[PDB]
Design a protein around this ligand. Structure first.
Ligand SMILES: *[C@@H]1O[C@H](CO)[C@@H](O)[C@H](O)[C@H]1NC(C)=O
Ligand SMILES: *[C@@H]1O[C@H](CO)[C@@H](O)[C@H](O)[C@H]1NC(C)=O
Ligand SMILES: *[C@@H]1O[C@H](CO)[C@@H](O)[C@H](O)[C@H]1NC(C)=O
Ligand SMILES: *[C@@H]1O[C@H](CO)[C@@H](O)[C@H](O)[C@H]1NC(C)=O
Ligand SMILES: *[C@@H]1O[C@H](CO)[C@@H](O)[C@H](O)[C@H]1NC(C)=O
Lengths: 365, 374
C-alpha cells in the first residue's frame, strides 16, 4: 500500500472558498498524529479550469491523469458535466464532487450534494399549495422541474412556470413578477442559483411584494448565502433548506479553526460566510480518506498519455460504501454515487421548522 | 487564391449507417456536376466513427479531424456528447453542421439542420383543444418541448400528466403507466420519444387491446415514416404526426429515384429501408456547405488553413457566417438559419390518420402557425 495517495483537484471560476476549504481539509487530514487515522500522506495537484471550453476541461483532466492520481475532486457545470464525468468513467478514475447531482445512472462519480427534489415536493404538499409560480434556471439540471411535472395533476398543483436563467435585463424579472401579481399569485417556488435568487428577491422588495400574504420557497441548499433580510423585514413568509447544522460539533470545530486562518493563504475563510459547498468539500476529503483507509485495512492492491486501470473499480466501490459523519451529517451513497440516508433541515421565516429524510418525508416541529 | 479542394470532417455515431450512405451520396452528387459554376471546387471528406459518446472517443475523433485540416465538420451528437463536441468546435471557430436534435441554448459555431418541433406541437395541442392529456417523454432530444409545455399549461388550461419513460427497460412498465392513465380517464397522449421507443409504446398499446378506438396519439417526432403504427390505426385510433420531407417535392423525387437504385454494398440502407428524415437532412447539410463555400469563393474570402493547445482560426467566423446566411431549397424544404444556427422560416407538415383514412392535414410554420387543408 503506497505511503502517499495523490488526488487531483479540478477547480472552476467562483470556487475560491472551496479551494481554501480543500487545502484546509487536506491539511487537517495530514496533521493528525494518530497513525490509524493517518496511515498515508495525502497529496494533491490542483488545476483551475474554464468549463465553457472542452479544450480547458480535457487538458486539466489529462494533466491529472498523466500525473497519476487515485481520484479527482472537482466541480462541473451544465457545460462541463458530461465531458468531465465521461472522461473519469472511461478511464475508471473516480470523480468526487460537490456540484449538482444528476438523475442519470452514472458510474465513477461520487455526488456529495444530496438531491433536493424530494424535500421540495414534500413541502409543497405540506403547505397545500395549489396555484403557484415556479421560477427556475437549469444550472442544476432538470430533476426538480421533472418531479414537479410528474406530480402536478395528482396533487392539484397549477404551476405557472417561467424559465429565467437567460435573463440579463432585470426589468424582465420585474415584468414577470408584475404579471404574476395581476393573476393573484402569492406563492413562489424559486429554483435558481443563489446569485439569481438574490437578484429576484431584490426585485420582489423593489416592487413591494415582500409583505404579509406572499410566500417565497427557495429551492437551493445555499440558503445562508441568500440575501433575504430585506424580504423578511417586509413580513412575507420564506422557506429554505440546509444540510449544514450549526449545532453539529464537527461544524462548530471546523468553523472555529477556519475563521482564524490567514486570509492570504486561505482566501474567503475569514470574511465570507461558509458556503455549504465548502462544507461538502471538507466532507469530500473525509470520504476520500475513509475509502483509502478501508482499502489499506483490507490489503487491497491500489497500484499506480490520456488519449493514446481495474484498481479503479475497487476505489469506486470503497468510496461508495463509506458511512461517515461529516459537516453535512450522515454520509452514505447508493450504487450511482448519490447521497442516501441524508437529512435536509427546513427553515421558516428565522427558525428551524422541521426536517426531511427519504423515509419519514417532512417532519414538522 | 481559393483552394481547388475543400475538405470537411464527418463525425458519425452508432446507428447512423443510412446517414453515412446519404452523406457519401450527397458528396458524389455535388462532385459529379459538370457545370463549373455549381462545382468550382472539389469536395473531399474525412470520416471518423465514434465508437461511443464518451469523452475519450469524442476527443480523439475531434482531434483527428482538426489535425487533418478541415474547413467545417458535419456530424452527430447525443445528450452525452453534445456539449463536448460543440464546445470543441466553438473554441476553435470550426463550424459543426448537424442533423441531431437542436438546442434552446444560444450557441455559436453550430449549424442545426433539424428544425425545432415545439412550436408545431403547441399549435396542434391548441388546434385540437386538448385540456387533459398524458405527456410520455424521453430526454434524448433535450427538454425544449417539456419546458414549452410547462410554460404554457396554466394559460392554456392544459392538465398534463407527465411521465418520464426514457429509462424503462421492462416493457411491462409501459403497460402499468397506461393502466394508471386509464384510472385517470386519459384518452389523449403526446408521445415525445425516440422512434424506437415510440414503436415499443405502440406495441404495448396493441398487446393490451382496447387502447385504439377512442384514443388519440400525437407522435412528437419528425421520424414519422419510421414509426410502426399500422396495427394501432387498424383498431380505430387517431394518430397525429409531423414531417419535414414532402415525397412529392421534385428534389426529393429526383434524389429518391437515384437513391433507391444505389448498390447495397457501397450504400447500405438505401434500398432496404425508407429514407430517414435525418438522411434527408444529411443531404441538405451538403447543400448548405456547398452553397456557403461557393459564396465564399465569389466574395474572395480567405479560407486558408484549419489540437489541445486555444488559438481560434481567424477565417472561422467568416465561414460560420456564410453557412448561416444560406437560403436554399432542399429535401427538407426552405433552408435558412438564425444567428444561433437554428432553422428559421421552415415548414412542418402535419399528418392525420383516423378510422376514416389517412391524409396530410395541414402544415405549420412560425409566421402562419398551423394551416389546415380543407
Ligand atoms: C404564511 O405562513 C402562514 C403560517 O405561518 C400561513 O398561514 C400562510 O398561509 C402563509 N402565506 C402564504 C401566502 O401561503
Ligand atoms: C442511516 O444513518 C444512521 C446514522 O445517522 C445510521 O445509524 C443508520 O443505520 C442508517 N440507515 C441505513 C444505512 O439504512
Ligand atoms: C450552371 O448553374 C448556374 C447556377 O445555378 C446557372 O445559372 C447556369 O445557367 C448553369 N449553366 C449551364 C451551362 O447550364
Ligand atoms: C379523434 O378525431 C375526431 C375528429 O376526427 C375527434 O372528434 C376526436 O375527439 C378524436 N379523438 C380523441 C380521443 O381525441
Ligand atoms: C421564407 O421562405 C420562402 C420560401 O419558402 C421565401 O419565399 C420567403 O422569402 C422567406 N421569408 C423570409 C422572411 O425569409
Amino acid at each position: 500500500f503506497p505511503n502517499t495517495i495523490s488526488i487531483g483537484g479540478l477547480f472552476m471560476r467562483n470556487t475560491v472558498q472551496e479551494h481554501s476549504a480543500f487545502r484546509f481539509a487536506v491539511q487537517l487530514y495530514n496533521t493528525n498524529q494518530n497513525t490509524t487515522e493517518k496511515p498515508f500522506h495525502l497529496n494533491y495537484h490542483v488545476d483551475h479550469l474554464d468549463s465553457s471550453n472542452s479544450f480547458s476541461v480535457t487538458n486539466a483532466f489529462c494533466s491529472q491523469f498523466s500525473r497519476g492520481v487515485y481520484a479527482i475532486f472537482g466541480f462541473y457545470d451544465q457545460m462541463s458535466m458530461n465531458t468531465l464525468t465521461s472522461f473519469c468513467g472511461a478511464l475508471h478514475t473516480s470523480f468526487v464532487t460537490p456540484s449538482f447531482p444528476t438523475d442519470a445512472d452514472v458510474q465513477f462519480v461520487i455526488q456529495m450534494r444530496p438531491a433536493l427534489k424530494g424535500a421540495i415536493l414534500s413541502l409543497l404538499s405540506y403547505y397545500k399549495w395549489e396555484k403557484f409560480v415556479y421560477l427556475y434556471d437549469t444550472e442544476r439540471g432538470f430533476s426538480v422541474l421533472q418531479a414537479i411535472m410528474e406530480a402536478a395533476v395528482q396533487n392539484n398543483w397549477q404551476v405557472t412556470a417561467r424559465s429565467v436563467g437567460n435573463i440579463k435585463d432585470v426589468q424582465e424579472f420585474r415584468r414577470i413578477i408584475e404579471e404574476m401579481d395581476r393573476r393573484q399569485e402569492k406563492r413562489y417556488l424559486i429554483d435558481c442559483e443563489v446569485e439569481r435568487i438574490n437578484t429576484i428577491l431584490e426585485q420582489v422588495v423593489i416592487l413591494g411584494k415582500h409583505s404579509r400574504g406572499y410566500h417565497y420557497m427557495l429551492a437551493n441548499l445555499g440558503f445562508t448565502d441568500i440575501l433575504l433580510e430585506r424580504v423578511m423585514h417586509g413580513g412575507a413568509n420564506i422557506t429554505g433548506f440546509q444540510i449544514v447544522n450549526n449545532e453539529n460539533p464537527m461544524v462548530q470545530q471546523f468553523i472555529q479553526r477556519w475563521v482564524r486562518l490567514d486570509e492570504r493563504e486561505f482566501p474567503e475563510a475569514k470574511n465570507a460566510p461558509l458556503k455549504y459547498t465548502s462544507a461538502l468539500t471538507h466532507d469530500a476529503i473525509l470520504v476520500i480518506a475513509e475509502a483509502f483507509r478501508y482499502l489499506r485495512r483490507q490489503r487491497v492492491d491500489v497500484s499506480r498519455d490520456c488519449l493514446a486501470w481495474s484498481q479503479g473499480i475497487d476505489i469506486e466501490r470503497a468510496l461508495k460504501m463509506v458511512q461517515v459523519q461529516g459537516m453535512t451529517g450522515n454520509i452514505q451513497f447508493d450504487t450511482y454515487g448519490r447521497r442516501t440516508n441524508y437529512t435536509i433541515d427546513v427553515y421558516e421565516m428565522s427558525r428551524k421548522a422541521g426536517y426531511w429524510n427519504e423515509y419519514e418525508r417532512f417532519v414538522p416541529f
